[PDB]
């Protein structure tokens, strides 16, 4: 059974464009500057992934929210709030494994590299613009996992039918993030001054708005070999 | 009773800032180039306004969505979806009257000039940025009602505690861009290319992202003289 990777089960996706593929196959690659094999898997519904992984992602996201430096959330989410938020449409999990499927009951604290969601950034007439939010497991910090996450995203977002990518709020203090977007030729299409009240900064911090055409992506960024 | 105009009854507003006033008083002014008197009224809760006015605004917003040229919505809203959308936080109705309160059972088709909502544009850490959407009654096109609505907005948004204004999608084909926002020194802080699929346009239409500092507003724009 391959229902777990069928685009026909894409929920709450773009209204005007159908997926370009009937399915999305796991995408294997090596972490940058390493022999460590990682695999990205599509998530079209939570029922196809281990409960324990969902609960670990729930906690992972709350820690990120509590640091108060990256997401506009102030308070932690409930389990159902997180399910509604992260998995409203599409998501991806990236694990340290060479398996082409996700094994139950793994040690997520070591095996989960990162996750991201993809959804429409706007209501239906502008729903060909996707948004994405990312997370890296802090145990795997410093391995350039984010860069890899961004690449999987460029490979897969167009397959769901999206034509353009928008990040609404990349804080200028979030250097990890904007350097990746800069390096991958995401345009800075906007700048919100004093946008975020962030933990650890006494003054409000500016956010950059990133855009990228998903129909003309540079082949070298799609390649993870 | 003045509950209907107390900022203490403000639902779902900014998280870090309190309102700058205890109350919001009706703002009276004349339509530009005319001796017609208009009154702007605050709406903190729908219970304070007439059912027939709410029903008229519901159908008015659905007409605008059906035109398919200005909002990202594709389908008409249900009644409850309208309530949740337009009155999630704060709203304003601007009537052709010199009364300083809203009389029941008026002919809204002639008396209602315009309405707009005001709400946080983002989750709590960035909720000092407010968003607004406007509606002009079609029967009052060509009387510069939008410009006046925009002036009411500059007067009232900061009173609720917002510090910066963001419009996410002003399509380049919407004349409000140059008839209003450009003229009131809303900066164009971003541009989303091919943002929207709009009725009557074959090519997707670009959308301007407008921002404006609400703590430092040109006083000639605040003045309704
Ligand atoms: O900037 C964005 O839109 C994503 C979602 C979250 O707000 C952080 N990054
Ligand atoms: O651009 C905005 O965000 C407001 C809401 C609607 O999209 C029209 N103007």
Coordinates of C-alpha atoms and ligand atoms in Angstrom, one line a residue:
Chain A
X1 CA 0.0 0.0 0.0
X2 CA 1.1 3.4 -1.1
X3 CA -1.9 5.5 0.1
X4 CA 0.4 7.3 2.5
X5 CA 2.2 8.8 -0.3
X6 CA -0.6 9.6 -2.8
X7 CA -1.2 13.2 -3.8
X8 CA -4.9 12.4 -4.3
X9 CA -5.0 12.4 -0.5
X10 CA -3.6 15.9 -0.2
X11 CA -6.0 17.8 2.1
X12 CA -6.6 21.6 2.1
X13 CA -4.3 22.2 -0.8
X14 CA -4.4 24.8 -3.7
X15 CA -7.8 25.2 -5.3
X16 CA -6.9 26.0 -8.9
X17 CA -4.0 23.6 -9.6
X18 CA -3.8 19.8 -9.3
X19 CA -0.7 18.0 -8.2
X20 CA 2.0 17.4 -10.9
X21 CA 2.7 13.9 -9.5
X22 CA 0.3 11.0 -8.5
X23 CA 2.7 10.2 -5.6
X24 CA 5.7 11.5 -3.8
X25 CA 8.5 9.0 -3.1
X26 CA 10.8 9.2 -0.2
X27 CA 13.9 11.3 -0.9
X28 CA 17.2 9.9 0.4
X29 CA 20.4 11.9 0.7
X30 CA 23.5 12.4 2.8
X31 CA 23.8 15.2 5.4
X32 CA 26.2 17.9 4.1
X33 CA 29.9 17.1 4.7
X34 CA 28.9 13.7 6.0
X35 CA 28.3 10.0 5.3
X36 CA 25.1 10.2 7.4
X37 CA 22.1 9.0 5.3
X38 CA 18.8 10.8 5.8
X39 CA 15.4 10.2 4.3
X40 CA 12.5 12.6 3.9
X41 CA 9.0 11.2 3.9
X42 CA 5.7 12.8 2.9
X43 CA 2.9 13.2 5.5
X44 CA -0.6 13.6 4.0
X45 CA -2.5 12.5 7.1
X46 CA -1.2 11.9 10.7
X47 CA -2.8 8.4 10.7
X48 CA 0.1 7.2 8.5
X49 CA 2.8 8.1 11.0
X50 CA 3.6 6.6 14.5
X51 CA 1.8 8.3 17.4
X52 CA 5.0 8.5 19.3
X53 CA 6.5 10.5 16.4
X54 CA 3.6 12.9 16.5
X55 CA 3.9 13.3 20.2
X56 CA 7.6 13.9 19.9
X57 CA 7.0 16.6 17.2
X58 CA 4.3 18.2 19.5
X59 CA 6.9 18.6 22.2
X60 CA 9.6 19.7 19.7
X61 CA 7.4 22.5 18.5
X62 CA 6.5 23.7 22.0
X63 CA 10.2 24.0 22.9
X64 CA 10.7 26.1 19.7
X65 CA 7.8 28.3 20.7
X66 CA 9.1 28.7 24.3
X67 CA 12.5 30.0 23.1
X68 CA 10.5 32.9 21.7
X69 CA 12.9 33.8 18.9
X70 CA 11.6 32.2 15.7
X71 CA 7.8 31.8 15.7
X72 CA 5.2 34.5 16.4
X73 CA 3.4 32.2 18.8
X74 CA 3.7 33.2 22.5
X75 CA 2.1 30.3 24.3
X76 CA 2.4 26.5 23.9
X77 CA -0.1 24.6 21.9
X78 CA -2.4 21.8 23.0
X79 CA -2.1 18.5 21.2
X80 CA -5.1 19.2 19.1
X81 CA -3.9 22.8 18.3
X82 CA -0.6 21.4 17.1
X83 CA -2.3 18.7 15.0
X84 CA -4.6 21.4 13.4
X85 CA -1.5 23.7 12.9
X86 CA 1.3 21.5 11.7
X87 CA -0.8 19.1 9.7
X88 CA -3.5 21.4 8.4
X89 CA -2.4 20.3 4.8
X90 CA 1.0 18.7 4.0
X91 CA 4.0 18.0 6.2
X92 CA 7.4 16.3 5.9
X93 CA 9.5 14.3 8.4
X94 CA 13.2 13.8 7.9
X95 CA 14.8 11.0 9.7
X96 CA 18.2 9.5 10.0
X97 CA 17.7 6.2 8.3
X98 CA 18.1 4.5 5.0
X99 CA 14.6 2.9 5.1
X100 CA 12.0 3.9 2.5
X101 CA 9.3 3.8 5.1
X102 CA 8.8 4.9 8.7
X103 CA 9.4 2.3 11.5
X104 CA 7.3 2.6 14.6
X105 CA 8.7 3.1 18.1
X106 CA 12.1 4.7 17.0
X107 CA 14.3 6.9 19.2
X108 CA 13.1 10.2 17.8
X109 CA 15.3 12.3 20.0
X110 CA 18.2 10.9 17.8
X111 CA 16.4 9.8 14.6
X112 CA 14.3 12.9 13.8
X113 CA 16.4 15.4 12.0
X114 CA 13.6 17.9 11.2
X115 CA 10.1 18.6 10.0
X116 CA 8.2 21.1 8.0
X117 CA 4.7 21.9 6.9
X118 CA 3.5 23.1 3.5
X119 CA 0.1 24.9 3.2
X120 CA -1.7 27.6 1.2
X121 CA -0.5 31.0 2.5
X122 CA -3.8 32.6 1.6
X123 CA -7.5 31.8 0.8
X124 CA -8.4 30.1 -2.6
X125 CA -7.7 32.8 -5.3
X126 CA -4.1 33.1 -4.0
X127 CA -3.8 29.5 -2.8
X128 CA -1.1 28.7 -5.5
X129 CA 1.3 30.6 -3.0
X130 CA 2.5 28.1 -0.3
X131 CA 3.8 28.8 3.1
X132 CA 6.2 26.6 5.1
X133 CA 7.5 26.4 8.6
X134 CA 10.5 24.4 9.7
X135 CA 12.0 22.8 12.8
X136 CA 15.3 21.2 13.4
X137 CA 15.8 18.8 16.3
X138 CA 18.2 20.6 18.7
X139 CA 20.2 17.4 19.1
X140 CA 21.2 17.7 15.5
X141 CA 22.1 21.3 15.5
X142 CA 25.2 22.4 13.5
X143 CA 24.8 19.8 10.8
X144 CA 23.2 22.1 8.2
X145 CA 19.9 20.1 8.4
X146 CA 17.9 23.3 7.7
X147 CA 19.6 23.6 4.3
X148 CA 18.6 20.1 3.5
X149 CA 15.0 20.8 4.7
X150 CA 14.8 23.8 2.3
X151 CA 15.9 21.6 -0.6
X152 CA 13.3 18.8 0.0
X153 CA 10.8 21.7 0.1
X154 CA 11.9 23.0 -3.3
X155 CA 11.6 19.5 -4.7
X156 CA 8.2 18.8 -3.3
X157 CA 6.2 22.0 -3.1
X158 CA 5.8 22.3 -6.9
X159 CA 4.6 18.6 -7.0
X160 CA 1.6 19.6 -4.8
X161 CA 0.6 22.2 -7.4
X162 CA 2.0 25.4 -5.9
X163 CA 3.6 28.1 -8.1
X164 CA 5.1 30.4 -5.6
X165 CA 6.6 30.3 -2.1
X166 CA 6.1 32.9 0.6
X167 CA 7.6 33.1 4.1
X168 CA 5.8 35.9 6.0
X169 CA 8.1 36.4 8.9
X170 CA 11.8 35.6 8.8
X171 CA 13.2 37.6 11.7
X172 CA 16.5 39.4 10.8
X173 CA 17.9 38.0 14.1
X174 CA 17.2 34.5 12.8
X175 CA 20.4 34.3 10.8
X176 CA 20.3 30.6 10.6
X177 CA 17.2 31.0 8.4
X178 CA 17.7 34.0 6.2
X179 CA 21.2 33.0 5.0
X180 CA 19.7 29.7 3.8
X181 CA 16.9 31.5 2.0
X182 CA 19.5 34.0 0.5
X183 CA 21.8 31.1 -0.6
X184 CA 18.9 29.3 -2.3
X185 CA 17.8 32.5 -4.3
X186 CA 14.7 33.3 -2.4
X187 CA 14.0 37.0 -3.1
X188 CA 13.5 39.4 -0.3
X189 CA 10.2 40.7 -1.5
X190 CA 9.3 42.6 1.6
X191 CA 10.4 43.9 5.0
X192 CA 8.1 44.4 8.1
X193 CA 9.8 46.9 10.5
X194 CA 9.5 46.2 14.2
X195 CA 7.4 43.1 13.4
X196 CA 8.2 40.7 16.3
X197 CA 8.5 41.0 20.1
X198 CA 11.1 38.3 20.6
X199 CA 12.5 36.7 23.8
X200 CA 15.9 38.0 24.5
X201 CA 15.7 41.3 22.6
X202 CA 14.6 44.5 24.2
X203 CA 13.5 46.1 21.0
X204 CA 11.0 44.8 18.4
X205 CA 12.7 43.0 15.6
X206 CA 12.2 43.4 11.8
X207 CA 10.9 40.5 9.7
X208 CA 11.9 39.7 6.1
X209 CA 9.3 38.5 3.6
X210 CA 10.7 35.8 1.3
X211 CA 9.3 34.8 -2.1
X212 CA 10.4 32.3 -4.7
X213 CA 9.0 31.2 -8.1
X214 CA 8.5 27.4 -7.8
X215 CA 8.1 26.9 -11.5
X216 CA 11.7 27.9 -12.3
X217 CA 14.0 26.5 -9.7
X218 CA 17.7 26.2 -10.2
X219 CA 18.6 22.5 -10.9
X220 CA 21.7 22.7 -8.6
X221 CA 19.5 23.5 -5.5
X222 CA 17.2 20.6 -6.3
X223 CA 20.1 18.2 -6.3
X224 CA 21.2 16.9 -2.9
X225 CA 24.0 14.6 -4.1
Chain B
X1 CA -25.2 53.2 28.5
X2 CA -21.8 53.3 26.8
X3 CA -20.7 49.6 26.9
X4 CA -20.9 49.6 23.2
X5 CA -17.9 51.9 22.9
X6 CA -15.6 50.8 25.7
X7 CA -12.2 49.5 24.6
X8 CA -12.4 47.2 27.7
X9 CA -14.8 45.1 25.6
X10 CA -12.3 44.7 22.8
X11 CA -12.1 41.0 21.9
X12 CA -9.1 39.3 20.3
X13 CA -6.8 42.4 20.1
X14 CA -3.1 42.8 20.5
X15 CA -1.5 40.8 23.3
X16 CA 1.3 43.2 24.4
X17 CA -0.4 46.5 24.2
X18 CA -3.3 48.1 25.9
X19 CA -5.7 50.5 24.2
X20 CA -4.8 54.2 24.5
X21 CA -8.3 55.2 25.4
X22 CA -11.2 53.9 27.6
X23 CA -13.7 54.7 24.9
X24 CA -14.1 55.2 21.2
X25 CA -16.5 58.0 20.3
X26 CA -18.4 58.3 17.0
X27 CA -16.4 60.3 14.5
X28 CA -18.4 62.7 12.3
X29 CA -17.3 64.3 9.1
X30 CA -18.4 65.3 5.7
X31 CA -17.9 63.4 2.5
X32 CA -15.1 64.9 0.5
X33 CA -16.3 67.8 -1.7
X34 CA -19.8 67.7 -0.2
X35 CA -21.9 68.8 2.7
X36 CA -23.2 65.3 3.3
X37 CA -22.6 64.3 6.9
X38 CA -21.2 60.8 7.7
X39 CA -20.7 59.1 11.1
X40 CA -18.2 56.4 11.9
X41 CA -19.2 54.0 14.7
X42 CA -17.1 51.4 16.6
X43 CA -18.3 47.8 16.7
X44 CA -16.8 45.7 19.6
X45 CA -19.5 43.2 19.4
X46 CA -22.4 42.5 17.0
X47 CA -24.9 42.5 19.8
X48 CA -24.6 46.2 19.9
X49 CA -25.8 46.7 16.3
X50 CA -29.0 45.9 14.5
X51 CA -29.6 42.5 13.1
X52 CA -30.7 44.0 9.8
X53 CA -27.5 45.9 9.5
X54 CA -25.5 42.7 10.1
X55 CA -27.6 40.9 7.4
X56 CA -27.0 43.7 5.0
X57 CA -23.2 43.6 5.5
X58 CA -23.2 39.8 5.1
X59 CA -24.8 40.1 1.7
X60 CA -22.6 43.1 0.8
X61 CA -19.4 41.2 1.5
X62 CA -20.7 38.2 -0.5
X63 CA -21.3 40.5 -3.5
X64 CA -17.7 41.7 -3.3
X65 CA -16.4 38.2 -3.1
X66 CA -18.5 37.2 -6.1
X67 CA -17.0 40.0 -8.2
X68 CA -13.8 38.2 -7.5
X69 CA -11.5 41.1 -8.0
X70 CA -10.5 42.4 -4.6
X71 CA -10.5 39.6 -1.9
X72 CA -8.7 36.2 -2.0
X73 CA -12.0 34.4 -1.1
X74 CA -13.5 32.3 -3.9
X75 CA -16.9 31.2 -2.4
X76 CA -19.5 33.2 -0.6
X77 CA -19.5 32.9 3.2
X78 CA -22.2 31.4 5.3
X79 CA -23.8 33.7 7.8
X80 CA -21.7 32.3 10.7
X81 CA -18.5 32.4 8.7
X82 CA -19.2 36.0 8.0
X83 CA -19.6 36.8 11.7
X84 CA -16.4 35.0 12.5
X85 CA -14.5 36.7 9.7
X86 CA -15.7 40.3 9.9
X87 CA -16.2 40.6 13.7
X88 CA -13.4 38.4 15.0
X89 CA -11.9 41.5 16.7
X90 CA -13.0 45.1 15.9
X91 CA -15.1 46.6 13.2
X92 CA -16.5 49.9 12.0
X93 CA -19.7 50.9 10.2
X94 CA -19.9 54.3 8.6
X95 CA -23.4 55.6 8.1
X96 CA -24.9 58.6 6.3
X97 CA -26.3 60.3 9.4
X98 CA -25.7 63.0 11.9
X99 CA -27.0 60.8 14.8
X100 CA -24.2 59.7 17.3
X101 CA -25.9 56.4 17.8
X102 CA -27.2 53.7 15.3
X103 CA -30.9 53.7 14.9
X104 CA -32.6 50.3 14.2
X105 CA -34.3 49.3 10.9
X106 CA -32.9 52.0 8.6
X107 CA -32.6 51.7 4.8
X108 CA -29.1 50.3 4.8
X109 CA -29.0 50.3 1.0
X110 CA -28.8 54.1 1.1
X111 CA -27.5 54.8 4.7
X112 CA -24.6 52.4 4.9
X113 CA -21.6 54.0 3.3
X114 CA -18.8 51.6 4.2
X115 CA -17.4 49.2 6.8
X116 CA -14.0 47.8 7.7
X117 CA -12.6 45.3 10.2
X118 CA -9.5 45.7 12.3
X119 CA -7.7 42.7 13.8
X120 CA -4.2 41.4 14.5
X121 CA -2.4 40.4 11.3
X122 CA -0.4 37.8 13.1
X123 CA -0.2 35.6 16.2
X124 CA 0.7 37.3 19.7
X125 CA 4.4 38.3 19.4
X126 CA 3.7 40.2 16.3
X127 CA 0.0 41.1 17.1
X128 CA 0.8 44.9 17.4
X129 CA 0.5 44.8 13.6
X130 CA -3.1 45.1 12.6
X131 CA -4.8 44.1 9.4
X132 CA -7.9 45.7 7.9
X133 CA -10.3 45.0 5.0
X134 CA -12.7 47.6 3.6
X135 CA -16.0 47.6 1.8
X136 CA -17.8 50.4 0.1
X137 CA -21.5 50.1 -0.6
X138 CA -21.7 50.1 -4.5
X139 CA -24.4 52.7 -4.5
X140 CA -21.9 55.1 -3.0
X141 CA -19.1 54.5 -5.4
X142 CA -17.5 57.7 -6.9
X143 CA -17.8 59.7 -3.6
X144 CA -14.4 59.0 -2.2
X145 CA -15.8 56.9 0.7
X146 CA -12.8 54.6 0.8
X147 CA -10.5 57.6 1.5
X148 CA -12.6 58.6 4.4
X149 CA -12.8 55.0 5.7
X150 CA -9.0 55.0 5.6
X151 CA -9.0 58.2 7.7
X152 CA -11.2 56.7 10.3
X153 CA -8.8 53.7 10.4
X154 CA -5.8 55.9 11.0
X155 CA -7.6 57.6 13.8
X156 CA -8.8 54.5 15.6
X157 CA -6.4 51.6 15.1
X158 CA -3.7 53.0 17.4
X159 CA -6.4 53.6 20.1
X160 CA -6.8 49.8 20.2
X161 CA -3.1 49.6 20.8
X162 CA -1.7 48.7 17.4
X163 CA 1.5 50.2 16.3
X164 CA 1.8 49.2 12.7
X165 CA -0.6 48.5 9.9
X166 CA -0.3 45.7 7.3
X167 CA -2.3 45.0 4.2
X168 CA -1.3 41.6 2.8
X169 CA -2.8 41.7 -0.6
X170 CA -3.8 44.9 -2.5
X171 CA -4.0 43.7 -6.0
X172 CA -2.3 46.1 -8.5
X173 CA -5.6 46.2 -10.4
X174 CA -7.4 47.6 -7.3
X175 CA -7.6 51.5 -7.6
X176 CA -7.5 51.8 -3.8
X177 CA -3.8 51.4 -4.2
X178 CA -3.3 54.8 -5.8
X179 CA -6.5 56.6 -4.9
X180 CA -5.9 55.9 -1.2
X181 CA -2.9 54.1 0.3
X182 CA -0.2 55.8 -1.8
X183 CA -1.9 59.1 -0.9
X184 CA -1.9 58.5 2.8
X185 CA 1.8 57.5 2.8
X186 CA 1.2 53.9 3.3
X187 CA 4.6 52.5 2.1
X188 CA 4.7 49.7 -0.3
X189 CA 6.9 47.4 1.8
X190 CA 6.6 44.4 -0.5
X191 CA 5.3 42.9 -3.8
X192 CA 3.9 39.5 -4.4
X193 CA 4.2 38.6 -8.0
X194 CA 1.3 36.8 -9.7
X195 CA -0.4 36.7 -6.3
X196 CA -4.0 36.3 -7.3
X197 CA -6.3 34.6 -9.8
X198 CA -8.9 37.3 -10.3
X199 CA -12.2 37.4 -12.2
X200 CA -11.9 39.0 -15.6
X201 CA -8.1 38.8 -15.8
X202 CA -6.4 36.0 -17.7
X203 CA -3.0 36.4 -16.1
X204 CA -2.5 36.2 -12.4
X205 CA -2.3 39.6 -10.8
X206 CA 0.5 41.0 -8.6
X207 CA -0.3 42.2 -5.1
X208 CA 1.2 45.0 -3.1
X209 CA 1.9 44.6 0.6
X210 CA 1.3 47.9 2.3
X211 CA 2.6 48.9 5.7
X212 CA 2.3 52.1 7.8
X213 CA 3.6 53.3 11.2
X214 CA 0.6 54.0 13.3
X215 CA 2.5 55.8 16.1
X216 CA 3.7 58.6 13.7
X217 CA 0.9 59.6 11.4
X218 CA 0.8 62.9 9.4
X219 CA -1.8 65.0 11.2
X220 CA -3.3 66.4 8.0
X221 CA -4.4 62.7 7.3
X222 CA -5.9 62.4 10.7
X223 CA -7.9 65.5 10.2
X224 CA -11.3 64.9 8.7
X225 CA -11.6 68.6 7.7
Ligands
LIG1 O1 7.9 32.9 8.0 C1 7.0 32.0 7.8 O2 6.0 32.3 7.2 C2 7.3 30.7 8.5 C3 6.1 30.3 9.4 C4 6.5 30.8 10.8 O3 5.8 32.0 11.0 C5 8.0 31.0 10.7 N1 8.4 30.8 9.4
LIG2 O1 -4.8 43.2 1.8 C1 -5.3 42.8 3.0 O2 -4.7 42.1 3.8 C2 -6.7 43.4 3.2 C3 -7.7 42.2 3.4 C4 -8.1 41.8 2.0 O3 -7.1 40.8 1.5 C5 -8.0 43.2 1.2 N1 -7.2 44.1 1.9

